[PDB]
Amino acid sequence: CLSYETEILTVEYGLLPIGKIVEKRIECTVYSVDNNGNIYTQPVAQWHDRGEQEVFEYCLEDGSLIRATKDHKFMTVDGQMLPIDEIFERELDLMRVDNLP
């Protein structure tokens, strides 16, 4: 689970805070990555207000911050989906697309 302000890239609107997306049930199209690393687009098919949970702030090398729950999986450079806390503990590298749109 991700904090309110974490921004998601939408085709129609650009970057939106997931909190706003969820709490307004915003229908929008987002970008996903392939089994083989191809980028494509698809619609959001579900919306979850999870309520309150324990959140950590993970500061990245580039100044980016991710505020999430420990278990929240992110894509590694090797293409695996691993909980961000384990990525942090194991000093693993996050995949970063750079060429989304």
Added chain:
Amino acid sequence: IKIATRKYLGKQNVYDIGVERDHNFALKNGFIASN
């Protein structure tokens, strides 16, 4: 890209969105978040 540090924030409102194909999506800088 590496995660430099980690700090606790306490409880706060959190969220998830759903996607039907490859259950992931992109965030601001090109990070790929699950769900």
